[PDB]
């Protein structure tokens, strides 16, 4: 499994940027996607995919230990829709 | 909707890197995630989320052209699992 440092070293190798500049850009990528989604804005990235949000419906159930009802409210959640290039690469 | 150029301008603003260097890093980010995923490896990015692949199981389906029952092969698809920080930002 790759971590952020593994991704950073490969970003540096692919671009010619230093590992420290690559790290700044990689962190900023995640931060920018986070901010657009926090503002309720979709982020479409040609050749990769689309980051967006979706409404996860309310759920109701029971605590198996107490028998008490648990109501989980409807919530906005992040979502990613892979583009063609990314789907083709993994299939 | 934000596109890749909108994201690159914000990566430049956040890091102090030129838009040209931000563009190189943003494109390399997507390429590195794609390669890891093409190798069947997961990429965990702390404070953002995890890119991975998942197997969609072989099943019985219907041929839309003939109307007849068919056997649909298992397929590997990309997937993204948002971390806590990203979920908290959008809720």
Curated annotation (Swiss-Prot), chains A, B:
Entry-linked Gene3D superfamilies: IHF-like DNA-binding proteins
Superkingdom, taxonomy of origin: Bacteria
Keywords linked to the UniProt accession: DNA condensation, DNA-binding
Single Gene Ontology BP annotation: chromosome condensation
GO terms for cellular component: cytosol
InterPro entries reported for this sequence: Hist_DNA-bd (IPR000119), Histone-like_DNA-bd_CS (IPR020816), IHF-like_DNA-bd_dom_sf (IPR010992)
Pfam families hit by this protein: Bac_DNA_binding
Entry's Gene Ontology molecular function annotations: DNA binding; structural constituent of chromatin
PROSITE patterns according to UniProt: HISTONE_LIKE
Keyword Methyltransferase: no
UniProt key word DNA-binding: yes
Primary role: Histone-like DNA-binding protein which is capable of wrapping DNA to stabilize it, and thus to prevent its denaturation under extreme environmental conditions.
Quaternary context: Homodimer.
Similarity annotation: Belongs to the bacterial histone-like protein family.
Protein name: DNA-binding protein HU
């Amino acid at each position: 499994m790759a971590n952020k440092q593994d991704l950073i070293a490969e970003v540096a190798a692919k671009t010619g940027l230093t590992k420290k500049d690559s790290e700044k850009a990689v962190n900023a990528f995640g931060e920018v996607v986070t901010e657009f989604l926090a503002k309720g804005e979709k982020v479409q990235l040609i050749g990769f995919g689309t980051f967006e949000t979706r409404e996860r419906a309310a759920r109701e159930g029971r605590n198996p230990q107490t028998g008490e009802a648990i109501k989980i409210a409807a919530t906005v959640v992040p979502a990613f829709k892979a583009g063609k290039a990314l789907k083709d690469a993994v299939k």
